[PDB]
């Protein structure tokens, strides 16, 4: 890595002495050392990079967003100086984008990634990084165009293949996504050994009837991406008790279960009133999990936040639930009504995290035609009764009754999570 331009080679001793202080952890000393070099040599790219790296380390030491924003600006200043070596220009801008994504400046990161692709049009990995920037903001269309542009030039790039297959699979192009996902993982290129790609390759194969799907779930399990072949959530706290079905006593949330079962008719009645008078509050499930039929949900809580307008449609239910922070505070779960009509089948699927358990309170359950499978066991609901399963295990639902099914879904923190973990875990 050639980081010194012609002038920087003539002050190589001073630059190495300052950088050695930063590698030793003397951050304040290194900050002032590079500050002096930037003063004496205001055009030095290596001195400016040292200033930025020291601000980067100082932000880590302080866990300070404001200090990191200063580092992000100094990484920019490096790129603005004359005669910046190509290796240094790329390092400074790549770190800038990486730190912008850390702060959540996803739009700003995108501008930095685009500039990197403009400066180095032959670096295919920078285009792949740009595609990740689009994926992080939720712009799958522009991400798809980026990887198609990469695959036009380098068809064998494994990173581009998995991410293209991921985009195709997200767009419900199930059959088309399989060879891109498969060949991408099989390439072994950096960035392809990711749990997201084993998860969706196996799921795509499941939807098309490919029996080789669980071979890829076992390979993902062997490489540390899945807790097991059945439990394939990707946002896990390791060690939590893993079983598909739970009894109320096993969860310890016996007071919540008692309240739901004592008061279930007021929950049902408000759900029915929304069906009859405000049906638009039920939104069709839009995560591509419905194989066929009609499936909608009316969400009262998500990420531990109460939807005020929705609770105006179920005020008594929300009042009852407010007494139970184990569900209203579950920032990795929801509280929602769920309606499924006859002819509905939900693809086998897995929730995102092992940090929640999912309760179903039966509200309107037809006598025949409705069942839910979790892992190897299929069960039925009962009106006014709570069943509890871990939806990080593969589960599946059928609705073949002659009228509608209505349930109340109440997520709780996994009981083995400490109060510390419940406060700090990022919301999902």
């Amino acid at each position: 890595p050639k980081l010194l331009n012609k002038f920087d080679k003539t002050i190589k001793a001073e630059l190495d002495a300052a950088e050695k202080l930063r590698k030793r952890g003397k951050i304040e000393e290194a900050v002032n050392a590079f500050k002096e070099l930037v003063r004496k040599y205001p055009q030095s790219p290596r001195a400016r990079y040292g200033k930025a790296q020291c601000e980067d380390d100082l932000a880590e030491k302080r866990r300070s967003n404001e200090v990191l924003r200063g580092a992000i600006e100094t990484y920019q200043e490096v790129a603005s100086l004359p005669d910046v070596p190509a290796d240094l220009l790329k390092l400074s801008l790549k770190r800038r984008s990486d730190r912008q994504q850390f702060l959540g400046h996803m739009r700003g990161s995108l501008l930095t990634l685009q500039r990197l692709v403009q400066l180095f049009p032959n670096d295919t990995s920078l285009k792949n990084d740009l595609g990740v920037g689009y994926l992080l903001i939720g712009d799958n269309d522009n991400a798809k165009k980026v990887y198609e542009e990469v695959l036009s030039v380098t068809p064998n790039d494994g990173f581009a293949k998995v991410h293209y297959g991921f985009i195709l699979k997200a767009q419900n192009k199930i059959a088309e996504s399989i060879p891109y996902l498969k060949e991408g993982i099989e390439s072994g290129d950096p960035g392809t050994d990711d749990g997201r790609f084993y998860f969706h390759l196996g799921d795509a194969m499941q939807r098309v009837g490919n029996k080789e799907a669980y071979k890829w779930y076992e390979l993902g399990h062997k490489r540390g991406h899945f807790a097991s072949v059945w439990q394939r959530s990707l946002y896990n706290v390791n060690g939590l008790k893993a079983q598909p079905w739970w009894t109320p006593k096993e969860t310890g949330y016996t007071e919540l279960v008692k309240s739901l079962e004592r008061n279930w008719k007021l929950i049902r009645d408000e759900g029915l009133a929304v069906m009859d008078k405000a049906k638009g509050l039920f939104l069709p499930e839009d995560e591509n999990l419905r194989e066929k039929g009609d499936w909608s949900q009316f969400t009262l809580w998500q990420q531990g936040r109460r939807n005020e307008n929705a609770c105006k449609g179920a005020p008594k239910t929300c009042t009852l639930l407010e007494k139970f922070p184990e569900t209203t505070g579950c920032r990795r779960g929801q509280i929602k009504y769920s309606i499924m009509h006859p002819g509905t089948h939900v693809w086998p699927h897995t929730g995102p995290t092992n940090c929640r358990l999912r309760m179903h309170l039966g509200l309107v359950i037809p006598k025949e035609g409705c069942k839910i499978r979790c892992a190897n066991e299929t069960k039925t609901w009962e009106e006014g009764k709570v069943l509890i399963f871990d939806d990080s295990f593969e589960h599946e639902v059928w609705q073949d009754a002659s009228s509608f099914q209505l349930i109340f879904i109440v997520d709780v923190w996994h009981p083995e999570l400490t109060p510390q973990q419940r406060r700090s875990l990022p919301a999902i």
Partner: peptide
Amino acid sequence: GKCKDGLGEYTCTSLEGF
């Protein structure tokens, strides 16, 4: 997009700095 019922999104969390 949010990962409520599944894992369809590229990332399911939202980074907001330290």
